[PDB]
Recover the amino acids of this structure.
């Protein structure tokens, strides 16, 4: 008695993987090449729709990772190649009479450098940080010479993490999860649909996450598998912790020509005093913050389980220290003063240092030379989350290195689906 | 409402928002490929629908009877007490059968029309 | 509990006009098709007109086809019938009834479920 | 004439060259993007026209009455005393209104057709 | 059979496999260009069918009489004793003439329909 | 066969100073010029 | 035997066999490969 009726424009969908396009309103990220923006990013609440999300299988994350690496390489590709600098350097100590923390940190080195004409060389003096050079047995080489050529980042291109929005192509839609206390997987009942995501700042850091979103109510602890020690634990804070970082040294930047239209920028000298780079964290805020984290960890591990935080265990600086880009300098900070406790039921200073030879995203084989920043640096940001790993007690240590987790912490709310507007159902009519 | 606003509502109610959904289906290499693919997808659905004898219609009915084996859960039970997202699972294994029948009971119609128009 | 209540009617001389109406409650008004049925003093029951639930499709018996209008208002929960060019043969009780055709998605009926008491029309 | 040959003529005469114009609408990255865009543009007009209940037609008409507020300019003395380029400006602020109405008084027709076909 | 399986069969027999062929017409720069072109080609044929007054149909007849100068070969001689590949050569010099006639004897129809609908 | 159709009775507004055809020609000429110099000999050894 | 023009001696003749002929080729010498870094990330491999 019933007949097949065909309906086109039916509001249904399937999980799908597609290419998203970006939009934003030079910079390292090619923000000028990414500008089909939307002043009115309408959001439609879907009543009575429950969808299953899985942030660990979210291909939006993999795309974001690839797009960032690609933009970085394009923007810093057409710059000066510092292949003439892979030479033997003759170095001494910059401030040999210094009795401070910086004793031995800055080297004063000489080079036989190329110049505009191929027939001549010039003698150049410059300062280097200890972590950028290797003694070869006086008698130093730049550390990158061991594996790769190094390119000078263009001085005209900013490292500021300008927000990027990801937008769906026609035929696709992005769904927000929007439940409170959403732990990354499962059935949010508060789902809404958008054309394009909010802007995400491509902030790159290890150990602690900076300048991201905050949890709405309480600290949320997420993991692919909370009982698997091979996995990382991503902790989203419901309050910011303000961190103030500085480079308390007034530096002078010098430059020379090293070829036909090519110039090298370097750390010339230091005016005033030589002081160690560092970051200030409110002592009370940090202790409160961990207390909240522990309270939530006990939900998975027991309220009679002792929880302790501990110092990072080893590997290179991108995994043993906190790292970030402030004012263009690349800082590495010792977080051992933070992750030191044991929980059972004024300010803190992280010493830091900087280095100019940077290997981004484990891309061994491609080094970047960060030109020095003139003057002094002050940078203020908040900690919005942290990455932890695990060894009748549990031991938690800071994690990092794989940048996908930094992006998982912003994209956990979204999934992409394909719209499939065609279907059938029985009705009572026969065409003719 | 707006695009997908009726997704959580009943099949009957949602049948009134087909226009809204239809208008949002259709509007450097990776992005260009995505646009080309979206067009090819769109055209495949339009071709298929046209083959079945359903051209510019958002709603059209045909001469293929509903089989009771195809999840024939009553009638008001689905139009008033079910959403399209649920219906899409109830009959997910029968869509290829149904589509084949829809194509067949069209080609037969075209031949009958061609013969009737040949009578003087 | 269905509440179909007719009003209007009265005595109108031949060639004249009147409007009948039926207010309704209990049942979702907008969910049902409705009709008018005539009870002539000696015929009992004659179908006159049918309107679908959205108020867009109307059908009439030939005898009133060029004269009567059936109309619906879903905000008012009102069914109405506008009569014109009345003739002596139209004297009858006119009943408001729920039923007849349906939506094509909902178990078509083709019968009347509920009746009002009827307005009296005398020409 | 030829493509756009009737552009300077009246709406009346121009209505007889619709075929000519239609055939000229449809057929390294930037060149490829231009071609893809032309296709998307074409398809959006076809989709819109199809939604309104006007599919394989160059000329069609509907049940939406013309409002007197939409540049009421006679009929016969304007239709044949005006070009399409001029007309396009006369009602440029009303096309969104008209398009919305064209879709509404179609969705209503599809529902009425579906119900009539359900009468045994 | 399958795609092009009827290619060696007579026109009559082959007219029953049109659905099969139609469904196989739809789905790094050189490859992407090939895909964009396949779409443009497809759309041109669909546009042409729409212009001729034959939209969502695989088979449709019109009001253009067959001219005997266009390779008259009886009737059964063609349908029961020739393949489409042979027919394609028999009238290869007349397709543009025929297409022009098919477009003209459509525009005449659209105008006649527009006028009939204007009667009250 | 570069066909041209006279648009009888059409008057239209032109502005050569805002004509983006110029910008495309400018960019295409530079691009072709530059592409043509890629597969060529560099003379950096001569800067002596 | 296939040719564009078998009577044109300037053309090649492509001959397709209906049976394989097995051929066993070898370099009967145990060679040692050495490598040297020749730049910052480059290495040359050679016959040692
Ligand atoms: C977390 O978010 C905060 C908040 O946005 C962010 O700190 C901000 O960083 C920017 C850039 O480092 C600071 O802006 C600077 O302000 C000084 C004030 O005098 C200006 O002089 C700076 O301009 C110089 O550099 C420009 C680079 O292109 C040149 O174009 C210009 O001519 C100058 O040379 C620049 O505007 C901003 O003040 C801070 N905000 C705060 C509160 O300190 C922080 O860095 C983010 N965290 C991380 C890790 O990125
Ligand atoms: C880069 O140079 C370093 C320094 O010589 C090499 O690594 C050292 O290997 C010895 C072997 O026991 C270790 O004890 C040192 O601690 C290592 N130093 C560092 C900094 O890791 C390194 O292998 C060279 N890299 C390459 C590609 O040859
Ligand atoms: C989540 O992690 C737990 C570890 O705590 C995994 O469970 C282990 O799976 C391995 C697989 O060979 C077993 O040998 C172990 O004995 C399991 N451990 C326990 C305590 O039973 C668990 O499978 C992980 N979840 C998933 C989906 O893989
Ligand atoms: C972090 O806190 C320390 C204090 O513990 C600040 O150090 C003082 O900075 C002022 C600035 O001129 C100096 O005069 C004081 O002598 C410093 N005190 C000590 C003990 O060194 C430090 O500047 C703070 N850093 C940031 C980034 O705020
Ligand atoms: C790095 O060491 C060199 C060598 O001592 C410093 O250059 C000398 O500075 C004194 C200061 O008056 C001059 O008299 C010498 O003639 C300089 N030597 C040469 C070879 O020029 C150099 O300044 C140190 N670099 C920094 C940044 O302090
Ligand atoms: C409804 O579907 C059923 C199967 O889902 C069809 O019945 C099958 O018909 C084939 C014909 O050869 C038989 O071999 C199967 O054994 C039948 N299956 C069952 C379960 O009986 C049925 O014919 C379909 N009905 C209509 C009206 O098409
Ligand atoms: C023609 O368009 C006018 C507006 O351009 C419509 O009139 C408006 O109708 C709304 C409905 O509530 C009123 O609020 C406005 O004040 C009216 N404006 C004017 C100027 O009257 C008019 O109803 C339309 N006519 C038709 C036949 O649809
Ligand atoms: C069939 O086609 C032929 C041409 O292929 C048409 O005959 C021509 O008609 C024009 C009209 O002006 C004459 O000038 C030609 O001399 C005619 N050609 C021949 C060979 O006579 C013929 O009229 C068409 N038939 C129909 C019914 O339209
Ligand atoms: C195949 O090759 C032969 C040999 O060259 C071509 O024959 C020659 O054609 C030229 C054309 O003027 C004559 O002058 C020669 O005398 C011909 N040679 C012989 C031996 O007859 C032959 O035409 C080629 N075939 C094709 C299809 O091009
Ligand atoms: C290529 O010739 C050189 C030069 O004779 C060989 O190297 C010598 O090998 C003898 C063998 O003991 C050594 O004593 C010499 O000191 C080597 N000379 C040098 C300069 O190192 C070399 O081995 C030959 N190459 C090969 C692959 O046989
Ligand atoms: C530069 O080359 C000369 C050549 O003798 C050498 O004496 C001098 O020490 C070199 N300079 C440096 C900084 O190595
Ligand atoms: C997240 O919620 C789901 C709900 O079933 C739960 O299974 C999962 O273990 C939760 N995640 C963590 C880290 O416990
Ligand atoms: C750094 O040195 C320059 C030299 O002119 C001076 O103007 C500037 O104020 C100094 N900055 C600080 C922080 O002392
Ligand atoms: C960071 O700087 C602000 C500036 O007002 C100051 O109030 C705040 O206490 C500083 N944070 C720390 C941890 O010292
Ligand atoms: C952290 O805060 C709690 C709040 O009562 C306090 O008891 C505890 O001693 C604090 N920890 C430290 C190390 O000060
Ligand atoms: C931890 O505290 C919560 C508070 O409600 C309680 O329900 C839970 O059982 C406690 N767990 C243990 C191990 O006592
Ligand atoms: C950080 O300070 C602690 C204090 O002992 C030290 O053990 C650790 O190695 C330091 N980390 C780095 C990266 O220097
Ligand atoms: C952890 O706290 C204890 C308390 O005395 C201190 O001795 C130890 O050095 C601290 N560790 C770090 C890494 O600061
Ligand atoms: C610190 O967190 C607050 C929370 O609202 C935010 O407004 C502020 O901008 C954050 N600080 C920085 C530097 O972004
Ligand atoms: C969600 O379910 C409630 C249950 O009565 C219903 O009233 C509401 O309209 C539903 N939402 C939508 C969008 O239909
Ligand atoms: C089918 O729907 C009708 C609607 O009232 C219901 O009464 C009937 O029980 C349903 N069929 C079955 C088997 O439940
Ligand atoms: C179907 O009726 C049940 C009755 O409780 C209700 O819970 C359910 O949400 C209804 N389904 C839909 C799609 O509204
Ligand atoms: C489709 O086939 C799978 C095979 O296991 C079955 O589980 C599923 O329920 C079937 N779906 C329908 C709609 O019958
Ligand atoms: C141009 O205007 C004149 C005025 O009479 C008219 O005759 C002529 O046909 C017009 N040209 C076109 C192309 O309509
Ligand atoms: C309006 O149309 C009538 C139809 O005859 C015409 O006579 C009249 O002049 C027209 N009015 C104008 C163009 O103002
Ligand atoms: C309309 O009539 C006027 C009367 O002079 C004429 O000038 C004008 O060109 C005509 N418009 C068109 C489009 O022909
Ligand atoms: C459209 O609105 C603008 C607003 O200034 C007005 O000037 C213009 O004439 C309007 N166009 C029409 C066709 O009324
Ligand atoms: C091929 O020709 C033979 C001749 O008898 C015919 O029987 C056969 O059906 C033909 N094949 C096809 C595919 O039509
Ligand atoms: C041409 O048609 C006639 C119609 O009767 C038929 O008899 C004749 O055999 C046909 N010619 C051929 C070659 O079949
Ligand atoms: C048509 O009939 C002739 C008669 O000899 C035959 O040779 C030819 O192959 C037939 N054509 C087809 C398509 O079978
Ligand atoms: C098409 O014209 C050519 C010109 O020589 C002719 O040979 C061929 O037979 C013609 N084709 C038809 C179908 O008449
Ligand atoms: C290949 O076969 C064709 C068949 O006509 C023949 O003409 C040609 O000469 C042959 N060529 C060779 C090289 O055998
Ligand atoms: C080649 O020399 C190596 C040296 O260890 C030896 O192991 C290997 O077996 C030799 N290969 C042959 C084929 O003799």
């Amino acid at each position: 008695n019933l007949w097949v009726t065909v309906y086109y424009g039916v509001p249904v969908w399937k999980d799908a993987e597609t290419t998203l396009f970006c939009a934003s309103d030079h910079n390292v990220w090619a923000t000028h090449a990414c500008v089909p923006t939307d002043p009115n990013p309408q959001e439609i609440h879907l009543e009575n729709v429950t969808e299953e999300f899985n942030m660990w299988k979210n291909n939006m994350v993999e795309q974001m990772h690839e797009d960032i690496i690609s933009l970085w390489d394009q923007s810093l590709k057409p710059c000066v190649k510092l292949t003439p600098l892979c030479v033997t350097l003759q170095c001494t100590n910059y401030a040999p009479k210094l009795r401070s923390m910086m004793r031995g940190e800055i080297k004063n080195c000489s080079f036989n450098m190329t110049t505009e004409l191929r027939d001549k060389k010039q003698k150049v003096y410059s300062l280097f940080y200890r972590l950028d050079v290797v003694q070869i047995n006086k008698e130093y080489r730049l550390i990158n010479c061991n594996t790769s050529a190094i390119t000078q980042a263009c001085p005209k291109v900013s490292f500021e993490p300008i927000p990027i929005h990801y937008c769906a192509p026609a035929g696709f839609a992005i769904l927000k999860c929007k439940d409170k206390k959403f732990n990354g997987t499962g059935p949010c009942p508060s789902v809404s649909t958008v054309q394009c995501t909010h802007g995400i700042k491509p902030v790159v850091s290890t150990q602690l996450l900076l300048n991201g979103s905050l949890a709405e109510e309480e600290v949320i602890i997420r993991s692919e598998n909370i009982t698997n020690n091979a996995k990382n634990i991503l902790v989203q804070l419901n309050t910011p912790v303000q961190i103030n970082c500085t480079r308390p040294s007034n530096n002078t930047v010098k430059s020379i020509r090293i070829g036909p239209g090519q110039a090298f920028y370097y750390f010339g000298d230091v005016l005033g005093h030589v002081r160690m780079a560092h970051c200030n964290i409110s002592k009370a805020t940090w202790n409160e913050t961990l207390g909240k984290v522990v309270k939530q960890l006990r939900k998975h591990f027991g309220n009679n389980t002792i929880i302790r935080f501990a110092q990072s265990s080893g590997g290179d600086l991108e995994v043993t220290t906190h790292s970030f880009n402030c004012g263009g300098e690349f800082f590495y900070c010792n977080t051992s003063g933070l992750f030191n406790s044991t929980w059972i039921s004024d300010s803190l200073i992280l010493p830091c240092w900087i280095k100019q030879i940077i290997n981004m995203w484990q891309r061994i084989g491609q080094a970047m030379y960060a030109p020095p920043i003139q003057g002094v640096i002050r940078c203020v940001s908040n900690i919005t989350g942290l990455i932890l790993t695990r060894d009748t007690t549990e031991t938690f240590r800071p994690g990092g290195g794989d940048m996908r987790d930094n992006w998982r912490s912003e994209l956990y709310k979204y999934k992409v689906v394909k719209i499939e507007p065609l279907g059938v159902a029985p009705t009572r009519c026969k065409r003719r | 409402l707006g695009f997908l606003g009726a997704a959580g509502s009943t099949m009957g109610a949602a049948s009134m928002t087909l226009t809204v959904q239809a208008r949002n289906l259709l509007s450097g290499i990776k992005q260009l490929q995505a646009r080309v693919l979206a067009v090819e997808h769109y055209l495949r659905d339009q071709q298929l629908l046209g083959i079945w004898g359903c051209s510019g219609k958002l709603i059209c009915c045909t001469n293929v009877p509903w089989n009771s084996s195809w999840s024939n859960r009553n009638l008001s039970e689905i139009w008033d007490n079910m959403t399209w997202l649920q219906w899409d699972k109830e009959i997910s294994n029968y869509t290829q059968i149904i589509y084949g029948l829809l194509e067949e009971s069209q080609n037969q119609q075209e031949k009958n029309e061609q013969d009737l128009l040949a009578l003087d | 509990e269905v509440q179909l209540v007719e009003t209007g009617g009265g005595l109108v001389q031949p060639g004249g006009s009147l409007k009948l109406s039926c207010r309704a409650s209990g049942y979702t008004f907008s969910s049902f098709a409705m009709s008018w049925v005539r009870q002539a003093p000696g015929k009992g029951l004659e179908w006159v007109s049918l309107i679908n639930d959205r108020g867009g499709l109307t059908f009439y018996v030939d005898s009133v086809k060029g004269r009567f209008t059936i109309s619906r208002d879903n905000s008012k929960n009102t069914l109405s019938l506008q009569m014109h060019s009345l003739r002596d043969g139209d004297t009858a009780v006119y009943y408001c009834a729920t039923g007849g055709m349906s939506s094509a998605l909902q178990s078509s009926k083709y019968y009347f479920d509920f009746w009002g008491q009827g307005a009296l029309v005398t020409v």
The radius of gyration of chain D is 18 Å.
